[PDB]
């Protein structure tokens, strides 16, 4: 038993809500929050800048060290750091940027890393500003992570066309 409240069942191991991630993570204080990111780490927008923003640009400052000393991330590659005031840690996942050319085949790796984790809170990788399609990120989610995963979709006519097109 845990402490997700109002997700939807999709799957064995995979549960929907339409919420907003950064309430969603204030209020659980999950384990493991995932975040959007890109490999430099530079949470401007979408999904990032809302966290970063939740953090008061804590993520941004420990980000930028995490850079500083290991160099960018892989597109499909992830770490682990803090999750400050969010959630005991971050881990960051690079899904591709379809508005950056990137691979969607990689997005199948990205997923990959939630399987490092027994449960999460997580976005879609590769939607809203990065630019893939959202049904397909839901696609690859639930026929390649294999841990409990619990996704945040913040806009409701969004959600609704992801539940009502599962199949
Ligand atoms: O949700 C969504 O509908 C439309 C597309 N799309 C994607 C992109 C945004 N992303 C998210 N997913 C879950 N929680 C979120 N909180 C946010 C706060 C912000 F300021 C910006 C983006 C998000 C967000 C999934």
Same mark, same amino acid.
């Given at each position: 038993?845990?402490?997700?409240?109002?997700? +939807?069942?999709?799957?064995?191991?995979?549960?929907? #809500?339409?919420?907003?991630?950064?309430? &969603?993570?204030?209020?659980?204080?999950?384990?493991?929050?995932?975040? $959007?990111?890109?490999?430099? /780490?530079?949470?401007?927008?979408?999904?990032?800048?809302?966290?970063?923003?939740?953090?008061?640009?804590?993520?941004?400052? &420990?980000?930028?060290?995490?850079?500083?000393?290991?160099?960018?991330?892989?597109?499909?590659?992830?770490?682990?750091?803090?999750?400050?005031? +969010?959630? #005991?840690?971050? +881990?960051?996942?690079?899904?591709?940027? *379809?508005?950056?050319?990137?691979?969607?085949?990689?997005?199948?790796?990205?997923? &990959?890393?939630?399987?490092?984790? &027994?449960? +999460?809170? $997580?976005?879609?990788?590769?939607?809203?500003?990065?630019?893939?399609?959202?049904?397909?990120? @839901?696609?690859?989610?639930?026929?390649?992570?294999?841990?409990?995963?619990? @996704?945040?979709?913040?806009?409701?006519? /969004?959600?609704?066309?992801? *539940?009502?097109?599962? @199949?």
């Amino acid at each position: 038993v845990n402490s997700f409240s109002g997700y +939807l069942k999709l799957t064995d191991n995979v549960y929907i #809500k339409n919420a907003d991630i950064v309430e &969603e993570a204030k209020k659980v204080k999950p384990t493991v929050v995932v975040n $959007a990111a890109n490999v430099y /780490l530079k949470h401007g927008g979408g999904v990032a800048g809302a966290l970063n923003k939740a953090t008061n640009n804590a993520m941004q400052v &420990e980000s930028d060290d995490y850079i500083a000393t290991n160099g960018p991330l892989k597109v499909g590659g992830s770490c682990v750091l803090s999750g400050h005031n +969010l959630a #005991k840690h971050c +881990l960051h996942v690079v899904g591709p940027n *379809v508005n950056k050319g990137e691979d969607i085949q990689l997005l199948k790796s990205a997923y &990959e890393n939630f399987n490092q984790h &027994e449960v +999460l809170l $997580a976005p879609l990788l590769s939607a809203g500003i990065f630019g893939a399609d959202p049904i397909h990120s @839901l696609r690859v989610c639930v026929d390649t992570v294999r841990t409990n995963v619990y @996704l945040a979709v913040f806009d409701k006519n /969004l959600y609704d066309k992801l *539940v009502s097109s599962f @199949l």
